[PDB]
């Protein structure tokens with residue numbers, strides 16, 4: 001079934017993955033350079049063995065697709081998935097006792113979840129507060145649609161690439177990179193989703209993602225879904241049908257905390273996977289909003305608390 | 307045997323690869339996103355089913371490793387493997403009838419192979435002629451060891467990464483990129499070897515290359531060898547033993563010209579693969595020269611004329 005690759009990567013890690021610690025003291029289990037292939041023509045890669053929230057993944061994807069780096073858009077869609085790093089960089093600004101809320105968010109959750117709601121609402125209406133503290137700066141929206149140059153101009157990689165899909169479907173140069181050597185040695189997040197590339201194959205748009213790093217429990221199921229949604233939107237924009245999504249990792253990992261959770265999931269059997277309908281009268285994935293994107297027949301197993 | 311992956315990728319392309327034309331009218335056969343794994347501990351990945359010239363591949367590798375982009379070093383080692391693009395950009399300089407020597411190099415080979423030897427020798431001793439025409443500019447040596455920044459400074463990615471292998475073997479951030487979005491829309495060669503990454507696994511240095519594009523006959527056997535040599539040198543520099551080399555492609559292709567050649571090769575059986583000895587008293591891969599690098603037991607089948 002379409003989502004087996006995800007389940008096989010989960011099992012290959014517990015069984016034969018290697019142990020090492022991390023930047024907090026919790027431990028991982030990992031493997032270098034494992035692929036996953038998902039034929040998009042046989043459905044859509046959202047895990048039925050764990051409810052994944054598609055609502056968020058679209059909001060967050062269209063964000064990137066606007067080239068915005070500002071947590072607001074995310075809030076006005078009820079998506080607090082990037083709150084944290086923004087919040088982070090508001091406690092240590094000269095203007096703010098939530099220092100290291102991370103290492104002890106789980107032992108006080110009545111103050112944080114409230115001082116995070118203060119931040120959230122001031123960002124939600126205060127322009128001058130958003131513009132300073134809502135803006136993540138260097139994140140998928142910039143690298144994808146406004147890569148900062150040398151002679152201080154800006155580049156829309158994804159834009160150019162898309163025209164280039166129209167122009168020369170058969171180019172081997174259809175690449176988008178989130179890896180800026182100049183930004184990564186001092187940076188919030190060195191882009192986990194490193195690099196992707198399109199490829200066009202008698203009618204079908206394919207795409208392959210190079211992902212330097214992956215939390216197989218929390219992160220990968222999401223990633224799989226953005227990047228297929230990404231592959232659908234673009235094929236749609238270019239009049240192409242949908243090929244394969246090909247997911248390649250350097251380091252794919254499980255933290256020792258998630259060992260039991262994933263095991264349970266491993267006991268679940270996949271279900272017929274769903275379908276994407278897209279608004280067949282827009283073909284400008286940049287001015288897409290939520291109702292242009294429809295998931296049909298999503299029948300997951302219960303979410304797994306984590 | 308160690309080199310089977312190469313033979314399987316060769317067969318998977320003829321059998322089930324898809325047809326398309328290219329930027330000259332000759333045709334390809336290709337497949338998106340195929341991996342290759344080579345355990346370096348069981349030998350060294352130089353094709354026994356076709357003699358590959360290791361002499362060149364080292365010279366060309368140490369070049370990159372010096373961060374030079376100037377064809378001279380290559381010439382004083384008797385390696386004309388990057389001559390062509392330099393020569394190219396000397397015929398159309400304001401100062402030079404060899405215009406489009408490419409599309410008809412094979413129908414006059416007594417004039418070219420001589421006007422290419424003129425270029426070659428003037429570059430070999432004339433400083434002011436080399437500095438203008440010997441310099442490729444934007445190529446593996448710059449991106450790897452001197453990436454041009456925004457505030458006009460320079461970055462040695464590979465350097466920093468190497469210290470970082472020593473420092474934090476277990477980082478998931480051990481990446482080197484040859485893909486500069488600012489340089490690729492107007493450029494000689496948008497780096498075919500896009501991106502690579504290290505990874506450290508109870509003692510063993512691994513490395514995985516993302517290669518956007520590949521001529522499976524002419525290019526890949528070379529590539530495989532540089533990138534294992536690359537993996538050996540660094541492990542050696544960090545006191546690590548040698549893990550896996552993991553070779554990932556976007557578009558891997560065969561041009562229709564090479565269909566018979568490769569078929570013949572496909573009839574050959576691999577042989578015990580060779581061994582690398584390295585000078586066990588240097589550990590500074592940047593000041594390596596040729597005699598510090600030894601291939602033991604290379605027993606290839608004959609080269610294949612192409």
Ligand SMILES: Cc1cccc2c1C(=O)N(c1cc(-c3ccccc3)ccc1O)C2=O
Nearest residue numbers: 081082084085102189192218219220222223
């Ligand atoms: C605090 C901390 C520490 C290590 C590693 C990450 C973070 C973190 O906040 N993120 C992150 C996750 C997602 C994300 C989005 C959907 C699903 C799962 C994760 C999106 C943006 C992010 O910056 C990390 O990867």
Ligand SMILES: Cc1cccc2c1C(=O)N(c1cc(-c3ccccc3)ccc1O)C2=O
Nearest residue numbers: 387388390391408495498524525526528529
């Ligand atoms: C002219 C032209 C046209 C298309 C594509 C390439 C070239 C070309 O000159 N090169 C190239 C090849 C190698 C190389 C090195 C060892 C083995 C095989 C190839 C090294 C540097 C290069 O720029 C192309 O990839």
Ligand SMILES: O=c1ccn([C@H]2C[C@H](O)[C@@H](COP(=O)(O)O)O2)c(=O)[nH]1
Nearest residue numbers: 192213214215216219220223478479
């Ligand atoms: O979409 C995402 C985003 C982040 N991560 C996580 C996994 C890693 O723990 C971390 C990568 O950054 P480093 O740990 O390598 O610094 O991000 C994912 O798995 N998927």
Ligand SMILES: O=c1ccn([C@H]2C[C@H](O)[C@@H](COP(=O)(O)O)O2)c(=O)[nH]1
Nearest residue numbers: 172173498519520521522525526529
């Ligand atoms: O080490 C190398 C260097 C170059 N190529 C070739 C194959 C492709 O024909 C070309 C890639 O550039 P584009 O054709 O995609 O423009 O370079 C290789 O296979 N291996």
